[PDB]
A paper describes a structure:
The human RNA helicase DDX1 in the DEAD-box family plays an important role in RNA processing and has been associated with HIV-1 replication and tumour progression. DDX1 differs from all other DEAD-box proteins in a novel structural feature, a SPRY insertion domain in the helicase core. In DDX1, this DEAD-box core fold is disrupted by the large SPRY domain, prominently positioned in RecA-like domain 1 between the P-loop (Walker A) motif and conserved motif Ia, which separates the motifs by around 240 residues instead of the usual to 20–40 residues as in other DEAD-box proteins. SPRY domains are known to function as protein–protein interaction platforms.
The protein construct used in the final crystallization setup consisted of residues 72–283 of human DDX1; however, clear electron density was only observed for residues 86–275 of chain A and residues 86–279 of chain B. The residues at the N- and C-terminus that could not be modelled are likely to be disordered in the crystal since we observed some ambiguous density that could not be interpreted. The models for the polypeptide chains A and B have a Cα r.m.s. deviation of 0.256 Å for alignment of all 193 residues (an r.m.s. deviation of 1.239 Å for all atoms), indicating that they are almost identical. hDSPRY adopts a compact β-sandwich conformation. The β-sandwich fold is slightly twisted and forms a bowl-like platform. Two layers of concave β-sheets stack together and are referred to in the following as β-sheets 1 and 2, and a third small β-sheet covers one side of the β-sandwich. β-Sheet 1 is composed of eight strands (β16, β1, β4, β13, β7, β8, β9 and β10), β-sheet 2 is composed of six strands (β2, β3, β14, β6, β11 and β12) and the small β-sheet 3 consists of only two strands (β15 and β5). We have discovered a positively charged surface region in hDSPRY that is highly conserved in DDX1 across species. This surface patch might constitute the protein–protein interaction site within hDSPRY.
Residue numbers in the entry: 86 to 275
């Protein structure tokens, strides 16, 4: 029943990564370690959007990764991250991108599978194209993902009102058609 819902996956997370009973408010309280998670479901086609809100001053990266990726988002060729210090990450390369963000900020995460485009907004401000989906990643489902270092975030896949509704024909990830969505490979009993 856990994989049937759009939420963060208790079966696909670091040891210190904790998920609230809503499935959406997440934290990791280990001071010197990064702990990550992926959502229960992933996207294979379409233009979609989710939001994440920062609840404190801890470090975090948010974005998308495939099932082959490390939960340490952006440290391999299967993940894309945007981090609070104003850096995008992919294949262990951290580049200046966008703006810094922190407590009280909301990051919008845009994914256009059909055009192969990843981009982000901060409090409704378009930060620009962050990544193109590379040839090696084509035809592979992308799951919302984060990694935290002594931080707390809250996801919104579309089941609650968006603080900054998506532009340009992107729609809530939770409203993606059934045939364009893929269940996580990480499951169990609840």
């Amino acid at each position: 029943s856990v994989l049937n819902k759009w939420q963060m996956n208790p079966y696909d997370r670091g040891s210190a990564f904790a998920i609230g009973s809503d499935g959406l408010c997440c934290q990791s309280r280990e001071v010197k370690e990064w702990h990550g998670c992926r959502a229960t479901k992933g996207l294979m086609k379409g233009k979609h959007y989710y939001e994440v809100s920062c609840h404190d001053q801890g470090l975090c990266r948010v974005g998308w990764s495939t099932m082959q990726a490390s939960l340490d988002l952006g440290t391999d060729k299967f993940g894309f991250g945007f981090g609070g210090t104003g850096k995008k990450s992919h294949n262990k390369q951290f580049d200046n991108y966008g703006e810094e963000f922190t407590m009280h900020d909301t990051i919008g995460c845009y994914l256009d599978i059909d055009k192969g485009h990843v981009k982000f907004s901060k409090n409704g401000k378009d930060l620009g194209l962050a990544f193109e989906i590379p040839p090696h990643m084509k035809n592979q489902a992308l799951f919302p993902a984060c990694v935290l270092k002594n931080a707390e975030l809250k996801f919104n896949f579309g089941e609650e009102e968006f603080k900054f509704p998506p532009k340009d024909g992107f729609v809530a990830l939770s409203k993606a058609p059934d045939g364009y969505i893929v269940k996580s490979q990480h499951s169990g009993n609840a």
